[PDB]
Amino acid sequence: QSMKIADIETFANEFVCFVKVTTDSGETGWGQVAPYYADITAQVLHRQVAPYALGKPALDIDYLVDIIPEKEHKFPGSYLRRALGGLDTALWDLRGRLEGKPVCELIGGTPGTVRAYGSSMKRDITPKDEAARLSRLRDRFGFDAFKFRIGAECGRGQDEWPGRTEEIVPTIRAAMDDSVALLVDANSCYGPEQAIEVGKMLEQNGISHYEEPCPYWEYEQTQQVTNALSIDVTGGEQDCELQNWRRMIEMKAVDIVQPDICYLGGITRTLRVAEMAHKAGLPCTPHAANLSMVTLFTMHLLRAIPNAGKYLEFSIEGEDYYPWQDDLFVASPYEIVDGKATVTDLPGWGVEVSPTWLETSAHQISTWQ
Amino acid sequence: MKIADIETFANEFVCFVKVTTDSGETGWGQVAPYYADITAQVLHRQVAPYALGKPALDIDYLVDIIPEKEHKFPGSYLRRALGGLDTALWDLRGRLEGKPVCELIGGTPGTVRAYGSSMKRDITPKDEAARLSRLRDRFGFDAFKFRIGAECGRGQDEWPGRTEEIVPTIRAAMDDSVALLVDANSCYGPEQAIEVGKMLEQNGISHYEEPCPYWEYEQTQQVTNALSIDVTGGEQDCELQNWRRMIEMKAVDIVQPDICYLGGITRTLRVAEMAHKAGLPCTPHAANLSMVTLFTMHLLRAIPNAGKYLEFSIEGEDYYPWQDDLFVASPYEIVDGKATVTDLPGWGVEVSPTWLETSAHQISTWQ
Ligand SMILES: [Mg+2]
Ligand SMILES: [Mg+2]
């Protein structure tokens, strides 16, 4: 008898939901679904994911991740994939713990360090404040790459306020030495013509990464931008469907692919996207926008994949922006030294969810009958 | 007129939506069936905050902007919740103007030819032949759809030989004036799909629905290109950019959006219009007798490229126990094989108070 999945448990609040899997012999692993409306994701997982997993071989993640999107074929898109990513990440943890190895080792890497870029999420902050803040971060933690925001999120061509973009790009560049890589993200702001003009201005100021210039669901628009520019154009964080990834990569719509491990549905599906990209010659620089487990999943992936991109996205926002990210874990795995994060040799994900966070969570369980 | 309150009334299968304006006018619609109590929570948390306080008559603004406000949730549930709001706002306008929804969208009250649509793979070919003959005798249907293959079957039939037998068995049981349609529900790869479709063509079948994984447009396109029988699809497609591509590709002969899975009337009319420009008929998917069949009836009374018939589920209580007693007066009477859109304002139905009383209710109110 191979180990079977006996119980699937969730521990949630509106923001974050952890997933705990237990086998019929008592071994466990912990994962997490995508943050945001996590309490709803939890319900989807019990209702639409768990019925297909209970009683199944616990080590056969490929079966589950392959079959459940077809069992629930009337539900294409985000919520199902978010729920599946919780089960997948918990199962990889379970395996790591069984084998006594970190997830990066199971998927072909080794523990060690990863270059991080400090990622700013605010469009609210003035250019001068953002330059100040990033400079202080560079001094304190040693970051040698940063990402800041331009345009307005799905802004249909409009900036956050008049002139913010023209100001911020050279203000940050001025504050930072040429040894510091600068990245920007437009959050689907521009049509292609405008996106190209903005991109030529980025190229005048030593910016090296241009993320989501156009509505992300319009591949042709993005492809027009990639083709017209020299700056690397990057995208993919909201793309949760493998057939969509195959199409984006066939079209070479971007220079760099940026799946989000939780939005895409877990490590297994992310590894398939990274391989598709590797076959086409494209680096994979995953999206990780907060300090829930999404960052640590990404750290393990970047230690492993042959076409890992240049750095880990590492959110530098504090408690005003992500108050729900504080005290998720017994010990933070996110200490940065000399601009680098570290994957340790601890088994599985190598973290423990805070008992203080768990006491107050909404718990739900599905058990194999 | 502004949207003051958005209410849902749900169980696990069906959730109705009631919108009230700040001057007290109301309209009723429905989200897509299934996990409907999860869809209700999505509606309150991710749709209603963008609608409260907004002009009640401007449905275009809402259905256009909400998918962008919630761009982190591409896919089904957001769209299911949006269709609840859209259909209730169309009923509200219909009631305000004293007109059925079909008149608001350029059509007229009247009849629609229906096809009796079987959902079962369980049933033997002879039993399906018997049940359908009986339905033709009783109700006058002159078209039927039945199932072949297995749902998302990866090339396997429901049991060996079911498909080879059912196709000629139903064709032999039905007068030549009865049209026969099939649905493979994503069973086949293209090569197998072509071989099956060559058999359908030789056996008087005239409509071949979803031969391949719906998500693989190039596979379906290969089948459409190899066959003479009309290939059809679209019921799970809820993204307009995906519809654009499907149509531009001519991946199918006939598009079959589902008004509720796609996100309501305004969005389905955009799809229908994209199809009309590419010269494709639109024969929407409607698989149960919740309000989705009545929405489709009004759309087919109005759209210039309406396909041949309305999909009309012929399943009973054993398959859809949850659809009984939804409405005070059923809009679903069939005479001589046809459904009827009446001149009653809006959708022309009222949700049963007996169903409402046991529903789970939730409200979002403009502050
Ligand atoms: Mg981004
Ligand atoms: Mg169908």
From TrEMBL, chain B:
It comes from the Bacteria. The keyword Signal does not apply. It holds the Pfam family MR_MLE_C. One of its GO terms (molecular function) is hydro-lyase activity. InterPro entries: Enolase-like_C_sf, Enolase-like_N, Enolase_C-like, Mandel_Rmase/mucon_lact_enz_CS, Mandelate_racemase_C, Mandelate_racemase_N_dom, RHMD-like. Keywords: Magnesium, Metal-binding. Mg(2+) binds at D183, E209, E235. The keyword Amino-acid biosynthesis does not apply. Residues 126-230 form the Mandelate racemase/muconate lactonizing enzyme C-terminal domain. Its cofactor is Mg(2+). SUPFAM superfamilies: Enolase C-terminal domain-like (SSF51604), Enolase N-terminal domain-like (SSF54826). One of its GO terms (biological process) is amino acid catabolic process. CDD domains: MR_like. This is L-alanine-DL-glutamate epimerase of enolase superfamily. It comes from Hoeflea phototrophica (strain DSM 17068 / NCIMB 14078 / DFL-43).
